[PDB]
């Protein structure tokens, strides 16, 4: 189980970092307006 929690933390990380990139891209698009 600790190994599974670590893997789930990694999948969460991964998803949050994709979120940061899409947010940064929003922010860049808004800036071109």
Closest separation in Å from C-beta 8 to a copy of itself:
6
Query: 3-31 as b/e, with b when 16 or more CB fall inside 10 Å?
Result: eeeeeeeeeeeeeeeeeeeeeeeeeeeee
User: In the complex, which residues of this chain contact a copy of itself (CB under 8 A)?
Assistant: 1-2, 5-6, 8-10, 12-13, 15-17, 19-20, 22-24, 26-27, 29-31, 33
In the complex, the smallest distance separating the C-beta of residue 7 from a copy of itself, rounded to whole angstroms, is 9
Length, in residues, of the chain: 33
Minimum separation from the CB atom of position 31 to a copy of itself (A): 6
- Structure tokens that stand for 29 in this block: 């698009």
């Amino acid at each position: 189980r600790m190994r599974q929690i670590e893997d789930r933390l990694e999948e969460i990380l991964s998803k949050l970092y994709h979120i940061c990139n899409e947010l940064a891209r929003i922010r860049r698009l808004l800036g071109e307006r």
